[PDB]
Amino acid sequence: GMHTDVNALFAALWQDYIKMTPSAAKIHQLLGHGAPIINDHIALRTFNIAKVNLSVLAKHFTSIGYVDSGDYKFEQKKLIAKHFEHPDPKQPKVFISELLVEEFSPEVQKSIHGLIDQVDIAATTADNFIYSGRHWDVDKATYQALLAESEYAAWVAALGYRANHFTVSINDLPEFERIEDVNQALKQAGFVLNSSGGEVKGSPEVLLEQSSTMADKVVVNFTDGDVEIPSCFYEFARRYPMANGQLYTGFVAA
Ligand code: NI
Fold first, then answer.
1. Can you tell me whether residue 41 is helix, strand or coil?
2. What family is reported (predicted)?
3. In principle, which of 46, 141, 228, 238 could form an S-S bond with 170, CB 3.0–4.6 Å?
4. 92 within 8 A of 70, measured Cβ to Cβ
C-alpha cells in the first residue's frame, strides 16, 4: 500500500529523480550546503485513462493530508491539471496533470492505450507507484509517433511514472532574495540555464517568476534501441503576494 509519511514519499521520489537529474543533486548541495531545501512544488504527469488518471496519482497525496487546491486547463497542450496543498507549509505543492488522449490521432490513441494496458492495476496502489518508472515495452517508432504530436506523451512513454521536476522555493532560500541572483550563482557554478523564454519566465507583476536548468540526459532502453534523450530539468520559483496578502499559488503567469 501507499506511503504513510509525507517526508518518506518525497525522499523516495527525490532519490529516483536525481538518478535522471544529476544536476538537481549538485544544485541542491550548492544552495543548501547539505541542509534540506524547501521545495515550491513537484510536477507529475499521466494520461486520462481510468487505470492511471489524475485522481489515481492524487490519492498518493490526499491519503497523507494533501488537499485539492486548484483546477487548470491547458488548451494548446491538451492537458488538465490540479494542484494540491499540505497543511505544513514546508511541504511542496503537488502539481498533477493528465493528457487528454482523445485530442490526438487515432494512431497515437491506440499506441498510448497499448502502453497503459501493460500497467498492472495492482501497481497503482503500491507505495512506489509515482516513482515506479516504465511498466511497458515501447519501440522507437512508437516513441516518434507520440513525439510528432505531443512531447508530453513521448516523455511519459519514454520514462514512465517518475517526477518530471522538483522546484526550489526562492521565497524560502535564506541567502537569496531574487531569482536573478539565484540564476547568477548557478551560472557561476557552471550550470547552464534554459534561456528559451528568457532565463526568467514571468515577473513580479504576474506574481510568479520561474527559471530552470537545461535538462540532463538519460538512456532509454527501447525494444529496438538504446536512445539518449532529455530527462528532467530542476526549476526555481519565486511567488509574490496577491491583493489579500496570501502568496499566488498558480503555475503559469497570473
Ligand atoms: Ni513547475
1. strand
2. Belongs to the 2-oxoadipate dioxygenase/decarboxylase family.
3. 238
4. no
The end-to-end CA distance of the chain, in Å, is 38
Domain boundaries, the chain: 3-241
Backbone angles phi and psi of 184, in degrees to 5: -65, -45
C-alpha cell of residue 32: 543548501
Phi-psi region of 202 (alpha: psi -120 to 50; beta: other; left: phi over 0): left
Solving technique for this entry? X-ray
> Of 135, 128, 238, which Cα lies nearest the Cα of 182?
238
Q: Which one-letter amino acid corresponds to residue 155? A: W
Angle at 234 between CA 47 and CA 123, to 5 degrees: 35
Find the 43 Cα to ligand 1 centroid distance in Å.
Answer: 6
Radius of gyration of the chain (CA): 18
Distance 131 CA to ligand 1 centre (A): 17
Separation of CA 70 and ligand 1 centre (Å): 14
Strands 217-222, 93-99: pairing kind: unpaired
DSSP state, 133?
B
Rounded to the nearest angstrom, the distance between the alpha carbon of 2 and the centre of ligand 1 is 24
Resolution (angstroms) stands at: 1.8
Measured in degrees and rounded to the nearest 5, phi and psi for residue 25 equal -60, -40
Check residue 215 and report its DSSP letter: P
Torsion angle in degrees (nearest 10) through CA of 168, 174, 177, 182: -50
State how far the Cα of 57 lies from the Cα of 44, in Å rounded to an integer.
8
Report every protein residue that has its C-beta within 5 angstroms of ion ligand 1: 43, 167, 235
The fold of the 3-241 domain, in CATH, is: 2,3-Dihydroxybiphenyl 1,2-Dioxygenase; domain 1 (3.10.180)
